């Protein structure tokens, strides 16, 4: 089957494993990238997540590259950290 989980270079339509990252207080994509791929806040309701379920399988819809502009932020990353936000819907 084409249903295998992507691990890098995420593209629209990829199947991704979305996991709770307690240290960063957010859902992230499982990845071998050193960069954080956070789940976009808009995607939580349709994945039956809440702002917790440990993992869900999603389909990538959109990817956005971001940078922390303050030292205290919701992603628990230092000032200047770059990261992605990914919109995804349920794989099923």
């Amino acid at each position: 089957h084409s249903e295998k989980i992507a691990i890098r270079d995420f593209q629209v339509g990829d199947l991704v494993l979305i996991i709770l990252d307690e240290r960063h207080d957010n859902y992230v994509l499982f990845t071998v990238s050193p960069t954080l791929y956070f789940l976009h806040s808009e995607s939580l309701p349709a994945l039956d997540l809440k702002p917790r379920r440990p993992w869900v399988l999603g389909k990538v819809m959109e990817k956005e590259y971001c940078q922390a502009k303050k030292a205290q932020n919701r992603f628990k990353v230092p000032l200047g950290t770059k990261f992605y936000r990914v919109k995804a819907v349920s794989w099923n």
């Binding site: 971001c66 940078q67 502009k69 303050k70 205290q72 932020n73 919701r74 992603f75 770059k82």
Partner: peptide
């Protein structure tokens, strides 16, 4: 929110 982070 836009204070904390931005798209780059």
């Amino acid at each position: 929110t836009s204070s904390e982070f931005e798209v780059v």
